[PDB]
Design a protein around this ligand. Sequence first.
Ligand SMILES: [Ca+2]
Lengths: 72, 71
Amino acid sequence: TCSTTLIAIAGMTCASCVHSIEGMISQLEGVQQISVSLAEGTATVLYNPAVISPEELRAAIEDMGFEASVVS
Amino acid sequence: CSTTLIAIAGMTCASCVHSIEGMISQLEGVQQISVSLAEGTATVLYNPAVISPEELRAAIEDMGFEASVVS
Ligand SMILES: [Ca+2]
């Protein structure tokens, strides 16, 4: 079964980037779905914790040039 | 839900109005959309946890109509 993680993402200011983040993160092994809220500055990720971790997700987002933090 | 008003240029037929309604209304997070051909606008009721005015506007633009968020 999937777990959920909430990640704060700073610096998102366009639709293009929302879609780019969702595309990149969704394709990682174990990621079922990612919902980015441009309004709230967050991503909610449904993932298989046996194969990927919140800190791996966070790190992938950072690598795209956004500051990111696992909230919960 | 939140509400956004989007100005859309170039709506000059019923078929396009309905196309935009269909495409936008079916996006995840979108509860309702009303398009005004006379006023050149769409009013969208949406869940900001899931979708933004910026994304709505970009989706309309991707269909071939110039769009801007008014409020
Ligand atoms: Ca999305």
